[PDB]
Design a protein around this ligand. Structure first.
Ligand SMILES: Nc1ncnc2c1ncn2[C@@H]1O[C@H](COP(=O)(O)OP(=O)(O)O)[C@@H](O)[C@H]1O
Lengths: 269, 271, 306, 136, 68
RNA sequence: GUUGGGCGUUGCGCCAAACUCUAAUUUAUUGAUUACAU
């Protein structure tokens, strides 16, 4: 039937083992747009294989490009992948906080499109523009199992025609991959995105613990819920207190029905 | 009120192609800028006895000058290296020091109504975790300048870094042990930070867990163990010289010792 | 000279003039090797003939500046790396908005700077028969499409003064220039001069051609002899040689060796045919090395396989 | 847990104390570790080890509320407990730097990136201070 | 998935609405569409302009909490 | 960390060599090029 050469290459890549090679294989065989006739069973197989091959991979930030941000004119950095710790050292007034603030406003976008359907997030405000310039741009490349996702977030002052339009091609890809993996299997591990700002100095207080048993019940227990108020700093302790109460209550409520069951077995004997 | 009328917004939305009206809009924006500039120019001219208070905060943060606010939408403006910018976007440590010094100076000038030198008053100031957001360059300077800008002020503070706690004499720094108070040993006023860490904070200068530290310890054990060239001194020397470099005052000494040991086995051949 | 000869062949130009021929475009999507879907809009089998004819007519009075190996006759991807072989450093640009933002407003003035005169009716013909309307509605926005047979040459004409000025600047700083569509690669022998080249290309891309296209501030990549260096698929060795790369170099030789043992299906015989044919346009030598190692009898069985 | 004023109780040196009255230098770390552990458990369903997840954790100004005795054991302990999480962090204490390879520390001054000198791993604290902070 | 697909009418052309909410993951099986109701609201908004005192319909609900 | 050579228990294992401006190639039913069937 003369399967296209690109399709054969993708099949060979999937046989070698990749997660995107089978993603773009269950979306090539599930629609007529990509140029091949839609086969449902052999697309479902590729979707299952793509979801199965996602396990064991680590999601890391590879490089970053600041242009006319808070204090940096043009910055290019590459974070190590074989090492799991990067340290920024400098004077108070050089801009180490600026790079972290630039990693967020993109991590917020990634979390928003990985958890919610909002397709919104943070952006470059007018006060963060470099004094004198008009345009700013932040670019971040996300890595997963050696396969990279592009990103760029930019702004322009509303007096000149915009010379840098926003683009989120790869993060939509990553969110769709993870959501499909969740769809086929409810217990697929997802990456963690969070920052802890200096405001965690006053994290624990009696006020927070006083009313921790007066919050909504459905705000703590589901996979897609460990993302709200997670990149705002201020490591949450009220929700942790509620969670600890529920786990200790599961231990103190079960293990007694177990004791009751053992007593019932003894009585029946 | 006039430029934000709903009728104006409706008129602007109705006719997108309004270049003739766009010219008037840009003229209005130019008038906006001119009026705001004039209103702000009616400010940055003169000052009062506030100048003495202002001089207190320019010393702790070098490169800072021309602190005013803006009569346009409210903000406070500094000048850092000929770059005028708002206070809200300063660094965390810079804002911490600025707020601290400004508050103390305000207190001191309000308590002392009429003095030639209002800024050196009598009182008590307590600071907790003075090294919270400060670079080590400012840590060894924070206190000697603090005692100079404010003279007759007690400054009982708590620290968590050796750099800040080696500019004060050894008899005026207090150590809280498990349950008792102890005094620091002599030699803290101008000593090396490593000595302060080792004999005041009870921490080793070399992390006693890393692989390279253990390798160096084994190398120093082997050099003095009468086998200075038994292939393992060789392996570990080839590793550590490449890692640290041939020029460091930890391996240069020990390589000199190895050279002396090499020389020691020359005249003993005839024995 | 377009409207005069338009009706000479297939005298149906009276129709299809008012029936929005720019709308006559099929949109499909090809999968990339990695993340991404590439929209391609190609004309109906009839419009491509007219577009090829008008390309041939346009080629009569035009000039294309050198150092731009973008779809000019008799210039493969090898000469792109031939210029760049003698350099030590490289700065690979990648332009954004791949051919999909080159509006017809930016071609007529480019031709005016080119010093060629075009008729108003001929201008309407160019605007109507050599562009694509995405909205598919009347009085829409016209953008060039990746896939039209008329895309390469117009994409070259719209960037001609930029290429000349960047080449003039690169000559004075001992910098080699080349460009394949949008794969601008800058190479030099001096150290710490590529920043000036990047600033110059950024400030000249926003002055003549306007703020229309910008530099993708994500794929700006640096390289030297320390790491891998490539110019459009061709690998430049540290010994100043043009080769494919060790992985492909061993893949092809493993396949041609397996040919001798006869353990390969007929599907991959065409794969080896294509790979051996392609290992003549980049490395003219590799096949000679295979002949030196395996023999002429081995090579002269795939190139003429039955 | 103690249910009278709905408060937690933790034991140190055979002394029962409430979390709300602990030292300021021990509640920030407590909440940080608790939040990371809870989020990893929530994001990673039933598994042999639920703390082996991936992602980006940005600990900003790690030197807060830490005696210079835990700074030599904070990064390696986070990496030992959480061995599959990236930990891009910023610091100003020169006793955190001398536990990581020199190729990872990224010095910043005057809006530019400078690589660390050779051998920033376990060494004399004065040398790392002098050659990374320009402080005598 | 979950969807409410109530359809309204104003003595004439039907003005539909679908209110849907799906868990992340199975996202393509139900989506909301507010086209008709937005159009109807635009109709009343235009009506208030041409005639300032134009009639509007009454919408209200009463739970058990009216007298409790 | 990257590049070119060699052997063959060859959709790549091993051996033998080298290089470090702070810094690695992905698009077809399109157009240019190599090659077979014409
Ligand atoms: N609009 C601006 N104009 C000029 N400089 C700015 C502007 N916005 C931010 N900055 C710079 O950003 C710096 C803030 O440093 P920061 O990002 O907080 O890092 P750190 O906390 O490690 O000192 C300041 O030095 C300031 O000069």
């Amino acid at each position: 039937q003369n399967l296209p050469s690109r399709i054969t290459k993708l099949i060979k890549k999937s046989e070698s083992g990749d997660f995107a090679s089978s993603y773009q294989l269950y979306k090539v065989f599930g629609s007529k747009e990509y140029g091949v006739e839609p086969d449902e069973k052999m697309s479902d197989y590729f979707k299952e294989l793509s979801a199965k091959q996602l396990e064991g991979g680590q999601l890391r930030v590879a490089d970053i490009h600041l242009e006319n941000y808070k204090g940096f004119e043009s910055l290019i950095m590459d974070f190590s992948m074989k090492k799991n710790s990067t340290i920024l050292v400098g004077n108070n007034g050089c801009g180490k906080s600026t790079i972290l603030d630039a990693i967020q406003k993109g991590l917020t976008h990634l979390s928003s499109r990985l958890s919610t359907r909002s397709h919104n997030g943070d952006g470059i405000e007018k006060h963060e523009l470099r004094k004198g310039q008009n345009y700013a741009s932040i670019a971040i490349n996300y890595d997963y199992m050696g396969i990279r996702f592009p990103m760029i977030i930019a702004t322009t002052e509303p007096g000149y025609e915009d010379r840098a339009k926003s683009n989120y091609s790869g993060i939509n890809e990553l969110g769709s991959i993870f959501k499909t993996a969740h769809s086929i299997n409810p217990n697929v591990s997802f990456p963690l995105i969070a920052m802890y700002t200096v405001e965690r100095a006053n994290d624990v207080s009696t006020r927070d613990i006083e009313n921790s048993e007066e919050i909504k019940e459905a705000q703590i227990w589901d996979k897609f819920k460990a993302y709200n108020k997670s990149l705002t700093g201020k490591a949450d302790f009220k929700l942790f207190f509620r969670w600890f109460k529920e786990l200790i209550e599961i231990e103190n409520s079960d293990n007694a029905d177990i004791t009751a069951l053992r007593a019932e077995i003894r009585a029946k004997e | 009120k006039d430029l934000d009328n709903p009728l104006l917004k409706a008129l602007l939305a109705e006719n997108k192609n309004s270049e003739t009206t766009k010219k008037l809009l840009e003229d209005h924006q130019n008038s906006l800028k001119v009026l705001k500039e004039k209103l702000n120019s009616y400010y940055s001219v003169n000052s009062k006895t506030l100048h003495t208070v202002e001089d207190a905060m320019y010393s702790f943060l070098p490169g800072f000058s021309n602190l005013k606010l803006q009569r346009a939408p409210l903000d406070l403006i500094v000048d850092k290296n000929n770059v005028s910018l708002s206070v809200l976007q300063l660094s965390q440590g810079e804002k911490t020091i600025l707020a601290l010094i400004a508050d103390i100076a305000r207190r001191l000038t309000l308590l002392n109504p009429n003095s030639v030198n209002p800024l050196d008053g009598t009182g008590i100031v307590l600071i907790d975790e003075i090294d919270l957001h400060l670079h080590p360059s400012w840590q060894q300077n924070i206190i000697p300048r603090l005692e100079k800008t404010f003279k007759n002020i007690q400054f009982i503070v708590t620290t968590h870094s050796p750099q800040v706690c080696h500019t004060i004499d050894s008899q005026n720094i207090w150590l809280l042990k498990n349950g008792q108070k102890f005094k620091a040993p002599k030699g803290v006023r101008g000593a090396i930070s490593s000595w302060v860490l080792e004999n005041l904070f009870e921490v080793a200068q070399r992390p006693p867990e890393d692989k390279y530290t253990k390798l160096l310890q084994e190398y120093k054990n082997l050099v003095f163990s009468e086998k200075y060239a038994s292939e393992d001194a060789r392996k570990l020397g080839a590793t550590l010289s490449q890692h640290f470099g041939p020029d460091d005052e930890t391996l240069v000494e020990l390589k000199l010792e190895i050279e002396k040991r090499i020389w020691e086995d020359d005249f003993e051949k005839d024995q | 000279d377009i409207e005069t000869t338009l009706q000479k062949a297939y005298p149906d130009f009276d129709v299809l003039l008012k029936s929005r021929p720019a709308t006559h475009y099929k949109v499909y999507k090809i999968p990339k090797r990695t993340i991404g879907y590439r929209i391609i809009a190609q004309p109906t089998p009839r419009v491509k003939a007219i577009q090829r004819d008008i390309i041939e007519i346009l080629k009569q009075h035009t000039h294309i500046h050198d150092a731009a190996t973008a779809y000019v006759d008799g210039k493969n991807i090898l000469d792109n790396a031939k210029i760049h072989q003698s350099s030590v450093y490289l700065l690979k640009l990648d332009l954004v908005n791949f051919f999909n933002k080159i509006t017809p407003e930016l071609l007529f003035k480019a031709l005016a700077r080119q010093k060629v005169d075009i008729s108003d009716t001929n201008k309407n013909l160019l605007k109507q028969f050599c562009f694509w309307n995405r909205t598919k509605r009347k009085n829409g926005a016209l953008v060039l499409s990746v896939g039209a047979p008329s895309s390469p040459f117009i994409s070259n004409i719209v960037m001609s003064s930029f290429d000349e000025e960047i080449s003039s600047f690169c000559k004075e700083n001992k910098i080699s220039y080349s460009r394949y569509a949008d794969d601008l690669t800058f190479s030099t022998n001096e150290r710490d001069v590529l920043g000036l080249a990047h600033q110059k290309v950024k400030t000249t891309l926003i002055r003549f051609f306007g703020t229309r296209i910008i530099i993708n501030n994500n794929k700006i990549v640096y390289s030297s002899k320390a790491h891998n260096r490539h110019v459009t698929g061709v690998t430049l060795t540290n010994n100043n040689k043009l080769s494919l790369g060790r992985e492909r170099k061993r893949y092809i030789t493993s396949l041609v060796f397996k040919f001798k043992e006869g353990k390969l299906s007929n599907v991959d015989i065409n794969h080896l045919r294509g790979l051996i044919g392609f290992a003549y346009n980049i490395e003219p030598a590799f096949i000679e090395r295979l002949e030196k190692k395996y023999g002429e009898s081995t090579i002269k069985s795939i190139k003429k396989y039955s």
